Design a protein around this ligand. Sequence first.
Ligand SMILES: [Hg+2]
Ligand SMILES: [Hg+2]
Ligand SMILES: [Hg+2]
Ligand SMILES: [Hg+2]
Ligand SMILES: [Hg+2]
Ligand SMILES: [Hg+2]
Lengths: 271, 271
Amino acid sequence: VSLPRMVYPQPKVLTPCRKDVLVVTPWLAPIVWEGTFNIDILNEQFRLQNTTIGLTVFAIKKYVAFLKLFLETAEKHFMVGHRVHYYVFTDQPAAVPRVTLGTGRQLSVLEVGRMEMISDFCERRFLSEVDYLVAVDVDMEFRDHVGVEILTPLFGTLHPSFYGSSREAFTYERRPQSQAYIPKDEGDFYYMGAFFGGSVQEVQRLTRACHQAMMVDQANGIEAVWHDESHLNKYLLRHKPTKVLSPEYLWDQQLLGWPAVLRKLRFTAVP
Amino acid sequence: VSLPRMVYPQPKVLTPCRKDVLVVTPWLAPIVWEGTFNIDILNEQFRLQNTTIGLTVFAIKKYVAFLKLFLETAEKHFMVGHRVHYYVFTDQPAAVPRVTLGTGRQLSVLEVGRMEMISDFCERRFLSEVDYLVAVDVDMEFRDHVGVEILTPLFGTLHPSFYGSSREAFTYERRPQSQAYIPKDEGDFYYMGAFFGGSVQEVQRLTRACHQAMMVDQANGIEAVWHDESHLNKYLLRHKPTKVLSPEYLWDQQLLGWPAVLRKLRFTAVP
Ligand SMILES: [Hg+2]
Ligand SMILES: [Hg+2]
Ligand SMILES: [Hg+2]
Ligand SMILES: [Hg+2]
Ligand SMILES: [Hg+2]
Ligand SMILES: [Hg+2]
C-alpha cells in the first residue's frame, strides 16, 4: 500500500549520517541511533500495515514492584500510536498494578508456576494476536521514544557495557563444552539479554533454539556464564539480526552516565 | 539455517563506515557502497538459501550488438557462485550471441513482437524459476563485483548524474496531469531506470503498478518526461526501497570519470 505525499528534509547522499558511530553492520543491517531515521516515514509505513506489537515481560517474586513504573513509562514512550499488547508473566497476578492504558493497547496477565515460555506455552497465541514480539526486563523505565524504527524480522541490542569493547573482552561463553561457546576470534557484538525481538516467527525460532541448547547444556551438566544472554549471543552470531539497536535502547545512567555518543537515553535501568 | 564459524575483522561500533557518504536512508534501508559490506558473510547467507537470481535484459533492433560484451562480463562479475538465469528479450533470437556460461547459470531467449513484459507475459514463469529479479539495460558492461549485497525485497539505484543533486534539480515528471508527477518539495533520490530489482513478487508489483499508470497517462494523452524511469521514481517515492544501490552500480566513466567517492566502478555504460 502506497505512502501519502509527505514533506521532509531531502536525504543528503554526500553527508554521512553520523561520523562518530557505525550505522550499518557488515551484513547490511541498520544500527539504530538517533539521527539515522525519520520517524514520520517509519510510522506511516507500519501504521499502513496495522502493526500490532507484543511486549513480553517477566516479573517474578520481588520484581513485581517494578511493574508500575515500567508500564506507566511504556505508555508514554513505547510504540505510541500503534497497537500494543503487553504480556506480563508473573507468579503474582494480584500484585500486577492497575495501570491506565491508551486506546488500542491491552495487557494480559499470564500466571507462571523465559525461553520455554515464549517458544513453548505461548506459540499459537502470539502468532494469532501480534505481528512483532519484543522481550524486555521489567526493572527498567522508558525515558524517551522507543518506536517502530526497531521493528524488523530479528533484532538484538548492544549491551551498554561492551559497545566499545574488543571481541576478546566480550563475556561470551568460552568453554567448548557449552552450546553457547564462542571462541576469541569470533563475534560481531555483545548483545544484552534485556532487549531483543522481531517477527513472532523469528522470535519463536530463536527462543526454541535457545531452549533446546540450554537443555543440552543442562543434560551435559554445564550452565553458560550469562545464562540465556550467552545463548542469545550465540544465536545472533550464527543468525545475523536484521537490525541492531544502539545502547540508546538499553542504558544505565547511574552506572554509565550520559556520554556524547548518546543523543537520547530511551530505556534505562532503574537504580 | 545457521551460518558456519567464520573469521573476519570485528565490526567497530565507534568507527563510521564511511565519512564521505550516506550509508543508510531515513527509512533505514542500507545504501550499498564499497566498504559497507562483508561479501563472505552475505555470500554464506544467500548460498544457504540456494538463491537463484533472474536477470532480465531487453535487446531490440541495433541493441543486439551489445549482448556479447554484456553477457561475457556478467559471467565474470555478476552473482558468481550463485544460480543465475538470464532472460534475454529480443526481436532477433538468431542474433543472440552464443556466450559460454559457468555452471549453474542459464540463458533463455524470449522473442518479442518492458513493464508489461515483466508483469504480464512472464509472471508465472518468474515465480517458478527465480527468487529475485533484476532489470538492467543491455548497453552496459560489468567491470567489477555485482553480487548478493544488492538482493532485498525492492531496490533502486542512484542515477550517476544526480546523486549529489538537490531534489528541485531532479528530472522527475513535473506535470500534475501525469500519474508520475512529483512536486518540487517531494523526492528522496533520483533512481535510474537502467538498474532496479527485488523479489519476484515486489518486482511484479512494481511493473504492474508502472504499466497501469503508463496506460492511464496514455489514455490521458500524456507521456512522462523520462518514460518508465519517471514512473519508477514515483513508485519508489511512494513504496520505499529496502536497499538503495550507490552509483558504483550504474556509472558512465566517459561522461563522469572516476571520482573519489567511487572506490569501485562495477557496471558501466558502453561508449
Ligand atoms: Hg542521518
Ligand atoms: Hg540460542
Ligand atoms: Hg536466547
Ligand atoms: Hg564499514
Ligand atoms: Hg509506477
Ligand atoms: Hg516502472
